[PDB]
């Protein structure tokens, strides 16, 4: 009888083989859990990948407003496995009627970095900022703009710049941050990196975390001391510094400068 911050178990004790099998269980909760487990434990075996791809077409599990819970978790898992075999199925999920599938797919396509997703990502920006509204009673915008913009940056879709640039004036702060990130990735203009730096200085913690991840992803060197001094957890600081370090890669004085900051956040 005792208290644990991080428990031995959070669920059935699984192995890769068993998680993969459980994707086809009659227990839908167990399928859902298994798909999360495969992503969490980064089980990159080809049969895990194939099974998750198949679960992108699940019809057994449905929720509120015609959602597809297992498709969401499968989509999210595929992005963590690094296997671009998933790209076409994820691309298809960008036209899923369930918002949260579209979101999960766009986030995973951002992680996989495959440029073959560009046209389908571009289509979700149809109508531009004017159409980028929130439907009443929904806790989300009409499309997962944040993930879509981040994904278009990550895959190097330079043709999308003129569609992306207007989102810097979107009313939602998270959307503007994503558009700043994407704009920097696609144009390399410091002014867009600086907007991410300014979010670091902001009153909003979650936003600071996002800005850290973005500054890491783009490798914007000038933000190093602002990253190291930001009001956020060291974990996010180190990930941001690591991305800066990787862009500056033996050893320049700029790399050393970044390592010295990383050393101080341990």
């Amino acid at each position: 009888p005792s208290v644990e911050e991080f428990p031995a178990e959070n669920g059935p004790q699984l192995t890769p083989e068993l998680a993969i099998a459980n994707l086809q269980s009659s227990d839908l909760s167990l399928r859902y859990y298994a798909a999360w487990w495969l992503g969490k434990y980064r089980v990159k075996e080809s049969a895990a990948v194939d099974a998750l791809i198949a679960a992108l077409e699940d019809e057994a599990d449905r929720t509120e407003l015609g959602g597809y819970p297992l498709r969401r978790n499968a989509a999210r898992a595929l992005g963590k496995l690094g296997n671009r075999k998933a790209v076409p199925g994820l691309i298809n999920c960008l036209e899923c009627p369930d918002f949260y599938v579209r979101e999960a797919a766009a986030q995973s396509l951002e992680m996989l970095k495959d440029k073959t997703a560009a046209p389908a990502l571009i289509k979700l920006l149809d109508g531009g900022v004017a159409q980028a509204v929130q439907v009443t009673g929904r806790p989300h915008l009409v499309q997962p703009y944040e993930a879509v913009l981040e994904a278009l940056g990550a895959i190097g879709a330079t043709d999308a710049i003129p569609l992306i640039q207007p989102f810097l004036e979107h009313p939602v702060s998270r959307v503007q941050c994503a558009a700043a990130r994407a704009m920097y990735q696609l144009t390399q203009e410091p002014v867009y990196g600086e907007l991410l730096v300014k979010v670091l200085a902001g009153n909003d913690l979650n936003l600071r975390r996002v800005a850290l991840g973005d500054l890491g992803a783009i490798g914007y060197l000038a933000a190093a001391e602002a990253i190291a001094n930001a009001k956020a957890e060291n974990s996010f600081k180190l990930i941001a510094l690591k991305g800066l370090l990787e862009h500056q890669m033996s050893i320049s004085d700029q790399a050393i400068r970044v390592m010295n900051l990383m050393d101080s956040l341990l």
């Binding site: 911050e5 959070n10 669920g11 509120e64």
Partner: protein
């Protein structure tokens, strides 16, 4: 005041239970209008804070929180988070959903509660029973609940959990 919602949520990140419990009470009094921001400003990197978000959503009981609560109950590692979600899952105001999601939703809650009732930690199983009892107001769901509860009264190692089953059976 509605403008203060994000600040209230941010209070859960300062690990002062007194202050957090006040911010949560405030959110709950605001009710439905705070639900969208509560759902999209969950601290995924601080379980202490997250537990307050989940508790607050559970107390507001807007059924739009179903999928967050299911995730929390099923895949979170923090027990305080999971227990809060398990309780909440049996008590959301299902009729607020457009037909027939008002029928589907409680059934998905039940599926999750049945799943977490197998967890190895006694306190998760206890919370799962409490959630399950909350689903007594729904006629279609009573058979699997009865059934599950009997299987647990038979198999459970823990006297505490057996007792709570007995209280639920009444």
């Amino acid at each position: 005041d509605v403008a203060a919602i994000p600040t209230l949520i941010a209070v859960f990140g300062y690990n002062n239970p007194t202050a957090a419990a006040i911010a949560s009470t405030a959110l709950v009094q605001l009710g439905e209008v705070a639900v969208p921001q509560l759902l999209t400003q969950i601290d995924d990197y601080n379980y202490g804070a997250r537990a307050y978000s989940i508790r607050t959503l559970a107390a507001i009981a807007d059924p739009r929180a179903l999928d967050v609560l299911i995730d929390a109950a099923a895949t979170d590692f923090a027990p305080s988070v999971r227990r809060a979600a398990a309780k909440g899952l049996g008590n959301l105001h299902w009729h607020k959903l457009e037909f027939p999601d008002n029928q589907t939703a409680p059934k998905k809650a039940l599926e999750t509660l049945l799943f977490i009732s197998q967890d190895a930690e006694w306190s998760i199983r206890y919370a799962a029973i409490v959630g399950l009892q909350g689903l007594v107001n729904i006629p279609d769901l009573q058979q699997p609940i009865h059934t599950r509860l009997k299987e647990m009264l038979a198999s459970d190692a823990e006297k505490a959990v057996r007792a709570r089953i007995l209280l639920a059976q009444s």
